[PDB]
Amino acid sequence: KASGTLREYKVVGRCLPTPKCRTPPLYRMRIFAPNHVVAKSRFWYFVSQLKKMKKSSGEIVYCGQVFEKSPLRVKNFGIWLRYDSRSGTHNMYREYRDLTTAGAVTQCYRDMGARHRARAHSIQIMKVEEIAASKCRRPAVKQFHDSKIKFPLPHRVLRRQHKPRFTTKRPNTFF
């Protein structure tokens, strides 16, 4: 895999039926992926690690997007992981604070890139769970649990640095 911004996909699939299994059991997976074509690949990869079930043995029954039913809320996601190291694999549990499960998943991947130089193919998302204000462990997130939350905007470095490339005025960063 790679990225861009992920979505959620509900893939479901079954080992396709034989004489010896006339109505095989469907399976479902929260895939997070930049598009349905890869979602489905990703689905298989996971299924096969779990069940004896390869793409050629099976079919994907229903792959489709899953939209955030609470977009305009802001939520704290816990999110459990299983990345790889330059050494051996680890598990983690990180927390993000976002408007959409996708958003938080993407916002995870990026972080893992930064904090651990973990590429996507290295990473497995095992669950993403919206959470209460409480239950949140990470004080990164918990500093945004406040009702009278206030902060200034301090050394507010200018952009538009080349609009006026040259000029009279030295700028001003206090706002």
């Binding site: 500093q143 939350i149 902060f151």
Partner: protein
């Protein structure tokens, strides 16, 4: 990570007056003024209260090393206040096994000659950091007193005369000679 706000108070007492021009605390009171510029520390020195009763030092969005100044500024401001109110008096005894360490201030508390250390012909003339003044003690025998308002300037000037008296090429476990700083104090307690 970044921390949305840390901050701290300093109770300035009624004896003192403090101002602040921007980020440059100025402290005056009994013994005189003591300024200190904190351009280099990136904080919001809110002086607040009627009767101007406390200084308060914000720090928004600090990462670990940024936050750690917050206190240190505050601490430097107490010590400013302290010197204005009380003063600093760094006592330093002379310690020698044989050659007594003959000290003699000169200009006022500025110069400090230090003859017959280890029997050395060389006399260690030691100026002070200006604002400080050494003197010799009465009552206690082998003993200086470095009075001054600015802690930094005092302590530095102490060290100077601590360091002047070192031994070269010998075993300092054995050769325990010199002036060393016995006690850090004030000019008047209250």
């Amino acid at each position: 990570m970044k921390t949305i706000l840390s901050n701290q108070t300093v109770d300035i007492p009624e004896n003192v007056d403090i101002s602040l021009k921007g980020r440059t605390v100025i402290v005056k009171g009994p013994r005189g003024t003591l300024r200190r510029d904190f351009n280099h520390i990136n904080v919001e020195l809110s002086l607040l209260g009627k009767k101007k009763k406390r200084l308060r030092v914000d720090k928004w969005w600090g990462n670990r090393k940024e936050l750690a100044t917050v206190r240190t500024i505050c601490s430097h401001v107490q010590n400013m206040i302290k010197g204005v109110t009380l003063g600093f008096r760094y006592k330093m005894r002379s310690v020698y096994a044989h050659f007594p360490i003959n000290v003699v201030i000169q200009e006022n508390g500025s110069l400090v000659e230090i003859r017959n250390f280890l029997g050395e012909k060389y006399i260690r003339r030691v100026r002070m950091r200006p604002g400080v003044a050494c003197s010799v003690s009465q009552a206690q025998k082998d003993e200086l007193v470095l009075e001054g308002n600015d802690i930094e300037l005092v302590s530095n000037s102490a060290a100077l005369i601590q360091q002047a008296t070192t031994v070269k090429n010998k075993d300092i476990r054995k050769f325990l000679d010199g002036i060393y700083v016995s006690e850090k104090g004030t000019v008047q307690q209250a």
